[PDB]
Each structure stands twice: as structure tokens, then as C-alpha cells.
Design a protein around this nucleic acid. Structure first.
Lengths: 111, 325, 122, 111, 111, 110
RNA sequence: UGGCUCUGCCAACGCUACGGCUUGGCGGGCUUAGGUGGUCAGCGGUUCUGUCCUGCUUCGGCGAACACGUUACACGGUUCGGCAAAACGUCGAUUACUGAAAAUGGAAAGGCGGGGCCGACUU
RNA sequence: GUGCCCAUCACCU
RNA sequence: GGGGCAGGCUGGG
């Protein structure tokens, strides 16, 4: 549970966002590489979180989810050619919200 | 629009509308806990709001009621101001369209400043000799919230917009909450009932209402006193509004309407305004805040560009130096 | 409905990021302009610009003042990048006006970071 | 260490060919996968010297992230790059280095 | 001491033009040189937000690494070589920043 | 001392950088990561010398160890031969020299 | 986005496990809204030192105390006419009507507006 | 707290 | 006496 569940729910974010994050033009290439490092690298944040139960590790899993939502906002708009159509941000934010819920429950379970 | 209006909750919860509501709710507030907590999963938040409203499971969070000096300012949560904005984007323009021309409050392209201009204008033409100015006691605090919902209900017909309007503003009490977009709208709409006892009944064609203040230029101070009595009796018996202040002055005292004092000829802002400004400037000087004063000055230079203040602007430039105009 | 909550809500992190998003929204277009060349400087500027959001965000969630100072260092580095993109980048990268505009936005984020550092420091 | 890295070399030697099969399209995921795969050696090595268990748990997180990458490359990576069999075989090799990492974690937190 | 950054910013101003010149051939060297050059400002900045001498020594290490980069980019061969002049006439600039860093290290060390 | 190790490591770089630029684009991530390990261990040494925590002198050792890994990895990476076994042998000698100096330095601090 | 784990060619730093690779050309392919202020409906308390006002009332209140010509004493895009068909608004009406039920259908004649329209002149 | 309006700031049509 | 304006001395903010 907890880490396993969060990651399986976050895998849905990655499975949604990775295709979007691979589409981000090479021009928005640094944004893309940094979005992909945020997206695929949030798994590491979750993984570290469920290997310590240090509640700071599940807060830095939340920080990553927060950064991932930043990326949606950025790739939604701040990214000129675009990279996460407004719909994609909406869909991704729902998935990240589900990961957010599980992270919140996990933060609480540790609290 | 064929009257009716019997499917507004479909348009209130259009993502395309709730996104407009969201952008309208956040406009200005993008440094607030509410926007910033909402902004996180904004389109996921708006997808659970859309689908709260589209279900009739939207329930307005409690008003956070503070007060500034003496008001009674009830705030709302960002989700709730967004629902209000999403109502008042469909629901507002089906009420603000019935608002007779001369209601100048919270309706696009009519304002404080299009009102004072309407009054001056209508005072200019008509060659008004007299005028009735009235005002509702504690308006938002005396709006029926019940005979309001007999006007929010001769025009909403959609039995779910109606139930969203009734969440965002309950149908019981005598307290339309002040500090609601939903409520600015429904107060214009309610006080729109007295506009339709001025313009419709009473055949008063020279008036202006700005939310609770109602100028009514005449020519017979006896007719305008009648109009007023008729207006007060109406707005008391029908709308539960006590009239705080009223007068039937000759157009000569100046119509203290909306920020200005409005003679036919000189919309002389108001001396209140001068002294408020004089003091504001003086304070700003002896507060070391002589950079927000440029903002204020530019503001008051707009309220006073129309009003007559060349000499006053010279005077304020001579007293403090600051570039007025 | 109650908006999708993140955990560890830092009003300050949320506000700083929303205000810093305006820095990014200003600077990202002109970073993605730093010519084809200057691409390493651009990638490093973009990693400083877009990656300051993570500095703020991690500062917000890991209530540790170390992470708040790291956010400040990043804003300082972003201010360096403005200096660099203006002066040292040779085509133009950033017009003097753009540095003036960006520095205003970064200053706003600087203010919020400062206030945030202060409120935590107490 | 030395033995963990020699056993992880087998993961790399299995996975690197798989990571190089990921099409250009998924090139940033590949570079990120390869930086997880080839860069877990650094995680092991740095623990080997600086024996602090902190550095040892980061090695575990990296192995866990590498396991994520297998999941990701098998399916989320849309041309499911890693076949399920390959994920199976890779996970066996990662599991072997996981065992050694676990034993090493245990050897360090003896008290 | 923030004359450090403003004296280092002429190292950057000298070295960046010739780093944004290391051909792709030497492109990882370039990216790493530029990250050393443009990223020494972060090292200084972190030093000045702490005046921890640790961060001040890290700034010195970075200047030393930047000096390495000059010597490395010298003997990179072909017409892409940082000319011997430029190695020397940047080592002068880095030396000026080195002097100020040394004084700053000293100011902190003898509080 | 940092100066000695770095000058001896510069010989590793001077041997390996040409070889690390020859690693095929196919093995391009490995190459860029090997190059970043190779040039980049200089920073590990330099940080170790311009400070002292002995953790920094271990992180230098870890980097040399990672560089040794990169040699063994690039030797027989795939059909696009990255690093010839000879090159690994030659480079391992140079890395061993900087390994010796790092070891002595770790010891002198310890 | 100084890409490509992308090819053909040719070089030549080089590296070659002698295949090539790398690298270079060279093709080619793949690559208005927002921010922030400030008003408007709508911060005081006390004595003091100047300073000025202290009128009106239809008894509700309105003022005044220098914007001083309280006014750029001159109007308008606050313009001036003409209309008010339409559309809009509004009442008729969540009526008639339809349909068991107006049930997230639904008028209209008509009535009332000016918000609208058409010119002039100015904007 | 609410809108309407003022200023200014960015930012392209 | 009351009142408006500018400064005294103190809350809100």
C-alpha cells in the first residue's frame, strides 16, 4: 500500500503526461526535458517517500506533485507553441489530484 | 430572450463558462489564498465544481464576514466566488438586460461614471428644474431575499439555476450578503423593481439609479415629491427597503450622485471628494508614500477631469508639487 | 466541492510561484529566443528560470529555511541570468527593456521570497 | 561497493540494449532511463565509499526508480519499449542487485 | 562581498563568448564548461547568502574548476581550441575573482 | 593536494576525452554521461581540494570509481563499439594513477 | 531551441574490436488577457493651535465652512433633432397555446419603455 | 469582500 | 455652543 498505491496512481499521471511531454516541441525542449524530469522523476520522490516514512519525504513527494502541476500550467500556457492543451492540463490535474489525494492520505497516515 | 430562461444551469456549468467564471474570479485575486489554493488543480477543481453545479450538489461555503470602516463585508471562498461568477455570467446578463437603462450599478458599460454622466446629461437636456434623490436605508441589508426571488424567478425559470441561485443566496431572510458578485447583481435586479416603478409605473423618464441611490430629476418639486412618496411606499411595501435619506431639491443644490455633485453645468465632483483627496495627498506626503500617491493622483485626476478642477489642480500642484494632470 | 487540496499549502509558496510564473511567462519567451547558439546558456537559463519554481515549491513543502534560502539563491541566479542574457549574450538575447521588465517581475518574486524567508525566520 | 556494482552491471548490460532500442521519438525518456540505469552505478559507488546509510538508501531509491523505468518503458512508453518478458528478466537482475543493496543496508544499520 | 559576482561577471563576459563557441564536437565539454562558467555565479550567490565558509570554498572550487576548464579547452585541438592567449587572459579574470574569493574566505575565516 | 591529482587526472581526461567523443551517437547518452563523468571528476577533485570534509575526498573516489565503471561499460557496450578493450586498459592505468593519489590524499587527511 | 540513439558522402582531430566510430562539412530526412495600485455604491477618537461657516426646511432632512465664477459660465458622444417599425428591454407570462401534466416546451396580440433606430453636427 | 470605473505596468494583435 | 477644512496627541490598518 501507500508507496505502491501512490506510484500506481502516479503511473497514470505519467502514462497521460509522458505522451504529452514527449510531444512538447524540441524548441520547448528544455521545458520538456525538465517537465519529463519532473513527471518521470516524481516516481523517485514517491519511491524515496515510502523508503523512509520520513514525513518530509512525503512532503517532497507533494512538492514534486506541486511542481508537476506547475509544469501543467507552464506547458498549458507559458509554453508558447503549447504542450499541454487546456484539456490536457484539466485531465492531467485530475490524475495528479488523485496522486495528491493518496499523498495526502499517506501524509496523514504518517502524521 | 423569448422570456423563459429555462436551462441556465447547462450554461453556468459549461466548462467554457466555468473557465470564464474562474478567470473572472481570479482576476485581481491571484495573490489570494483562494485563487492560489484553487489554481493548483484549477481545471480539476473546476471539473468538480462544474459537476457540483451540474448535479445540484453545489453548496455555498459560509461567508467569512469581516467589516471595514462601517460596512459588513462578507467574503466567500474562491470556489464560491467562481460559482457566483459562473451564475452571474449567464444569470447576470439575463437580469442586467431587464435593468432599465438608468440603473448604473454593476452592469457592464454603465458605471459610476456613466451614471454621473447620464445624470448631468439628463439634467443638461430636459432642462431639469428639480430633482428627487433617494437612497435605501440598509439596502443589501434590507433587500427581501424573497421578493428578490420573485424577480430572480420571473427570469430564471430554469429549476436548477434557480436552485444554484438559492444556494449562492438563500431565499429566506432580509439579508442579501454584501460582498457577493451574485449579490451585486441581485441587488441591482431588486432595486430594478423600483426603477420599474419609476419608469414603468409613475412614467418617470429622467432618473438614474446606482444600486441603492436613485436620482429623479423633475420640474415640479411637488410631482417629484409625489414620485418619491410613490417610490418609498413601493420599495417599502414590495421590497422591504426603508428609505434612509431622501430629498426633493431644486437642481441647484447639486445631485450628490455617485461620487460627484452634478449640476446641469458642473458635475463638480464633491467637496467631500476634494477634502478626502486633499487629506489623502497630504497624508501620502507625510507618510513617505509619494509613489502610490501618483497612482491615487492619476485616479483622482480621472474623477476630476470631467468635474471642474483646473484651478484646484493648479492649487494642489502649488501645495505639494506633484503632477496632477 | 472544496478545491483539490495539495498537502503542505504554503500560502507563501503558492503566491511566490504564481508571481514567479509571471517571471517565467515573461522570460520563457525571451529565453526561447536566445538564438540557436547561446543554446547552452539558454538551456541553463531555462533550467534556472523554470527550475526556480521547484526551488520555491520544495521550500514551501519542506518547511525548512534551508530550502527557502536555496529559492533565494535561485532568484539571485535568475537575476544573474538577466544580467548575462542582457550584457554577455552578444546578438541581444534580452533588450534592455526586457531586463527592466523581467527584473520588476523577479523583484516581485524577490519580495515574496523575502517576506516568506522572514515569516519562517520568526 | 564492488559486488553490487558487478551485479548491477548485469542489469545495465541487459537494460542498456533495451534502452537503446527505445525509438528516437521517446529519446528524452531514453536519455532519462539511461541516466537512471547507467547512473545508478554512481549511486552504488558513492555509497561504497561514503558508507552513510543515507547514501545507501538513495541507491535503493535509484533501484526502485530503475524498476519504475522498467514499468514505464513497458507500456507507458507507448511503443511499449521493454516487452513484458524483458521487464520480467530485467526485474530479476534488478532484484539481485536489490538483494545485495538490502544486505548492504542491513550490514550498515547493524546498530 | 558582491563585487565578487560583479568581477566574476567579467570572467563570464570573457569566457562565455568563447564557450558559446566550443563546437558541438566538444559539446559536452562546452555544456559542462558553460555550466561551470555561468553556474559559478550560483556558487558565489550561495556563498553570499550564507557566508558559511563551506559555501565560500565551494565557490573557490568552482573558480578552480573554471581554471581547469580553461586549461582543458586550450588543448581541445583543431581550430576550436581556446587559444593560449584566451586561456591566459581569462585566467587573469578568474584570478581577480580568485583574489576576491580568497579575501572573502579570509574575512570569514578570521571573523 | 588537489593540484597534483587534477594534473594527473587531466591525463585521464586527455586520454579518455578523445575516446569519449568517439563513443557512437547510438551510445550517445552513455557517451555524454561518460564525458560528464570524465570531465566532471575534475570538479570532484577540485571541490575536495578547495575544501575538506573527507566526504568530498570520497566523492572524488566515487567519481573515479564511476569513471572506471564507464570504461568497463563502454568496453563492450553493444555492436557500435564504444571503447576498445585496450582503451579501457590504458585509461584504467591513468585512472589508477589518480586513484593512487586520491587514496594517499584520503589517507593523509585521515 | 547550437537537435537526431539520422542516414547517404566525403574529409580528417582522432578513436578504432579494422567493421567502423567519431568529427567536420555536405546533402538529404526527422526535428486582448493579465498584474498591480486607487476610487465609487461607501478609517477614526479626543483636546489643542490657526482658519473659516453657522443658512434652509415641504420638518423627512438638506446644506455651509472656498473646486470660488463652489463651474474651462461652456458644452459633449453627457450633442441636437426625427422616430420607435424591427430588434432589445419589459409587462402580458414561467400565461394563452401545446401537452395528463409545462414537464428545464411555449407564444403572441397588446400595453409600457429607450436601452434602440435614423439623420444632422461633432466625435 | 463585491462589482463597475481610473491609473499605471507588462504583452502581442 | 455646534460645524467644515489644515496641523496636535492616540486606535484601526
Amino acid at each position: 500500500y501507500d508507496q505502491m498505491l501512490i506510484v500506481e496512481r502516479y503511473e497514470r499521471v505519467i502514462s497521460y503526461l509522458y505522451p504529452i511531454a514527449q510531444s512538447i516541441p524540441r524548441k520547448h525542449g528544455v521545458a520538456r526535458e525538465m517537465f519529463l524530469k519532473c513527471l518521470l522523476g516524481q516516481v523517485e520522490l514517491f519511491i524515496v517517500a515510502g523508503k523512509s516514512n520520513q514525513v518530509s519525504k512525503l512532503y517532497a513527494a507533494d512538492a514534486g506533485l506541486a511542481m508537476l502541476r506547475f509544469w501543467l500550467r507552464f506547458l498549458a500556457g507559458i509554453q508558447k507553441p503549447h504542450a499541454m492543451t487546456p484539456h490536457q492540463v484539466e485531465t492531467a490535474q485530475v490524475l495528479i489530484a488523485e496522486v495528491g489525494r493518496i499523498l495526502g492520505s499517506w501524509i496523514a497516515r504518517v502524521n | 430572450m423569448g422570456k423563459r430562461h429555462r436551462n441556465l444551469i447547462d450554461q453556468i456549468t459549461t466548462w467554457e463558462n466555468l473557465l470564464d467564471a474562474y478567470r473572472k474570479t481570479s482576476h485581481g485575486k491571484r495573490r489570494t489564498w483562494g485563487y492560489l489554493e484553487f489554481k493548483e488543480y484549477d481545471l480539476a477543481n473546476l471539473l468538480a465544481l462544474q459537476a457540483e453545479l451540474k448535479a445540484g450538489n453545489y453548496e455555498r461555503g459560509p461567508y467569512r464576514e469581516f467589516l471595514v470602516y462601517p460596512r459588513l463585508i462578507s467574503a466567500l471562498e474562491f470556489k464560491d466566488r467562481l460559482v457566483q461568477h459562473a451564475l452571474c455570467n449567464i444569470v447576470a446578463p439575463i437580469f442586467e438586460a431587464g435593468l432599465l437603462p438608468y440603473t448604473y450599478a454593476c452592469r457592464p458599460d454603465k458605471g459610476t461614471h456613466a451614471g454621473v454622466c447620464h445624470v448631468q446629461a439628463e439634467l443638461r437636456r430636459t432642462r431639469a428644474t428639480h430633482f428627487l434623490k433617494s437612497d435605501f436605508s440598509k439596502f443589501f441589508p434590507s433587500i427581501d431575499r424573497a421578493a428578490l426571488y420573485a424577480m430572480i424567478d420571473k427570469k430564471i425559470h430554469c429549476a436548477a439555476t434557480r436552485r444554484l441561485l438559492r444556494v449562492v443566496l438563500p431565499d429566506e431572510g432580509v439579508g442579501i450578503p454584501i460582498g457577493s458578485l451574485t449579490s451585486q447583481l441581485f441587488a441591482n435586479v431588486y432595486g430594478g423593481a423600483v426603477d420599474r416603478l419609476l419608469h414603468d409605473e409613475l412614467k418617470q423618464r429622467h432618473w438614474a439609479r446606482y444600486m441603492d441611490d436613485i436620482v429623479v430629476l423633475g420640474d415640479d418639486p411637488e410631482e417629484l415629491r409625489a414620485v418619491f412618496y410613490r417610490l418609498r411606499d413601493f420599495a417599502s411595501e414590495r421590497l422591504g427597503l426603508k428609505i434612509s435619506h431622501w430629498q426633493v431639491a431644486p437642481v441647484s443644490r447639486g445631485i450628490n450622485f455617485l461620487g460627484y455633485r452634478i449640476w446641469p453645468t458642473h458635475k463638480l465632483l464633491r467637496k467631500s471628494s476634494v477634502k478626502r483627496a486633499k487629506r489623502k495627498v497630504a497624508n501620502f506626503i507625510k507618510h513617505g508614500e509619494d509613489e502610490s500617491l501618483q497612482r491615487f493622483l492619476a485616479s483622482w485626476s480621472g474623477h476630476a477631469q470631467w468635474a471642474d478642477t483646473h484651478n484646484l489642480f493648479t492649487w494642489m500642484e502649488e501645495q505639494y508639487g506633484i503632477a496632477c494632470h
